[PDB]
Structures are given as structure tokens and as C-alpha cells.
Amino acid sequence: SGFVCNTCPEKWINFQRKCYYFGKGTKQWVHARYACDDMEGQLVSIHSPEEQDFLTKHASHTGSWIGLRNLDLKGEFIWVDGSHVDYSNWAPGEPTSRSQGEDCVMMRGSGRWNDAFCDRKLGAWVCDRLATCTPPASEGSAE
Numbered sequence: 001s002g003f004v005c006n007t008c009p010e011k012w013i014n015f016q017r018k019c020y021y022f023g024k025g026t027k028q029w030v031h032a033r034y035a036c037d038d039m040e041g042q043l044v045s046i047h048s049p050e051e052q053d054f055l056t057k058h059a060s061h062t063g064s065w066i067g068l069r070n071l072d073l074k075g076e077f078i079w080v081d082g083s084h085v086d087y088s089n090w091a092p093g094e095p096t097s098r099s100q101g102e103d104c105v106m107m108r109g110s111g112r113w114n115d116a117f118c119d120r121k122l123g124a125w126v127c128d129r130l131a132t133c134t135p136p137a138s139e140g141s142a143e
Helices: 029-040 049-058
Strands: 018-024 065-070 077-079 104-108 112-116 124-130
Touching: 018 049, 029 065, 029 104, 029 124, 049 104, 049 112, 049 124, 065 112, 065 124
Parallel strands: none
Antiparallel strands: 018 124, 065 077, 065 104, 104 112
16 A cells, blocks of 8 residues: 555645645746746647646636757747647737747736747646655745
């Protein structure tokens, strides 16, 4: 046996066996990937309409950052984990929102994704990590 504990109280969300660390912030995409890479988990890189909707709904007035990074521009979108997209969500018909650049994908607007260079000013740090426990020494509740 080897069941996890409960690292997903509220903001955090667990699925098949992984969880998502949902938080707030104010920077760029590169800052999100680096923030989760520090120790958190990984850049989410949502691939399930439910997971994307989950954080999308979780995002009150500030979108979230996903594990999506495009090669150059009109090329192909690759996940920070080193895996090409499979479903993608970047708003299909988004007039005056596709001709400017592409490199990082953000989430907002129609509760979905938006593909753009990296000028999108979001405000939520979303990361993914395998469900773990919560020691009394590390950050927990203390309330």
C-alpha cells in the first residue's frame, strides 16, 4: 500500500494521481514556470477541458499560467515538460487577438485559453505536482 495524504484542500486539485497548486501572482509566463520549478511542481500544462475549466473557474479576475511554450511563433506549441500539445484550447475564433505574437499560452476571456507571445498580464500562479502529504514543519494551515 502507498496512498497519499491530502495536499489538495481547496485551491489545490487532485485527479487520477496528480494535484494542481493554484495560487495568485503578478508577472509573466516564464515567471510561473520558474516559480513552480523552484520546488512547487511543474507548469500545469492542462490537457483536460475539465482541468482547464477548473482553474479557469478558479481564476476570479486573474488568469492562470499553463505549461505551454511555443517554439518560435507560427510553429508548434510545446509543453514545458517537453511534450507537444494534444488538445489545446487557444480561442479558435478570436479576431484581433491572433496577429501579434506567440510563445506562451494564458487562460481567461471565454473561460478558456489564449495563445499569444507573452504580453498577457495574468495574475495567478498555477502549477502541477503529484499528490503528497503536509508536514507540521512545512507550510500548511496553522490557523
